[PDB]
Amino acid sequence: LAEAAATTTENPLQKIDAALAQVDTLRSDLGAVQNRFNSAITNLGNTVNN
Amino acid sequence: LGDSVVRTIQTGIRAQFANSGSNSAFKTMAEIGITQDGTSGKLKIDDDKLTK
Amino acid sequence: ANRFTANIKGLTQASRNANDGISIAQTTEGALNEINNNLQRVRELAVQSANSTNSQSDLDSIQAEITQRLNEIDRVSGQTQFNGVKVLAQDNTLTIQVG
């Protein structure tokens, strides 16, 4: 369970920036995954035809 | 159907959004509010975000 | 007549052999098309890497899809095969029996 911290969160913008960096890095990784999958299905189509 | 001709032609267009010739603060069109339909690829716009 | 038949039949089978060769060559070309496309994307990435004010975090980002492209290339090379001949994975030579 999260705590009820006593005071203001110090340097909050840095927390937010780190979270955003994590999220965008993940998004890029998933885009690359989609690229891999597209290449693979294209290969499967060509090989099936041949 | 499945010709390499169309795949090459279209993918060459698709990949250019990297634009390896600019140091601008923007890197793609998402920062200026342009999104792409990942399901298909047709682009979409946001009027207010684009305006600001 | 028998000397004629021997040829006729042999060349008949040789036509099949030639068609098989066509098949295998076409398959190899099909794989190489994909390899080429991925390599061209890799070149695009490398060109993107050259921009002056890029940050090292951006360098790592680019390294990501670089790694992905190399992994995909190696995957295609290793996995692709034809009639049990993993054609792309090795150096080899085979003769089509056409004559």
Side-chain angles (χ1 to χ4, degrees), chain C residues 25-91:
Chain C
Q26 285 186 319
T27 306
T28 310
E29 164 268 308
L32 271 291
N33 284 332
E34 325 151 336
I35 297 294
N36 178 276
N37 283 266
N38 273 273
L39 286 163
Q40 295 207 49
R41 305 297 150 280
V42 164
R43 195 185 200 291
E44 302 159 21
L45 300 177
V47 181
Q48 197 88 355
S49 78
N51 292 269
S52 162
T53 71
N54 294 352
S55 69
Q56 280 158 310
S57 69
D58 315 316
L59 302 182
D60 308 330
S61 61
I62 302 152
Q63 191 86 37
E65 61 275 50
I66 281 163
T67 306
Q68 263 219 350
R69 297 291 176 192
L70 327 164
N71 297 349
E72 163 270 345
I73 287 298
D74 271 14
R75 181 195 73 79
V76 177
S77 172
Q79 300 190 312
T80 310
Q81 66 90 350
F82 181 104
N83 186 46
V85 187
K86 311 191 179 190
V87 314
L88 271 283
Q90 63 153 130
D91 295 352

Side-chain angles (χ1 to χ4, degrees), chain A residues 27-44:
Chain A
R27 294 162 85 209
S28 51
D29 317 333
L30 294 324
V33 162
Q34 289 170 90
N35 308 345
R36 275 197 78 178
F37 276 128
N38 305 329
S39 311
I41 38 156
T42 314
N43 296 23
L44 289 178

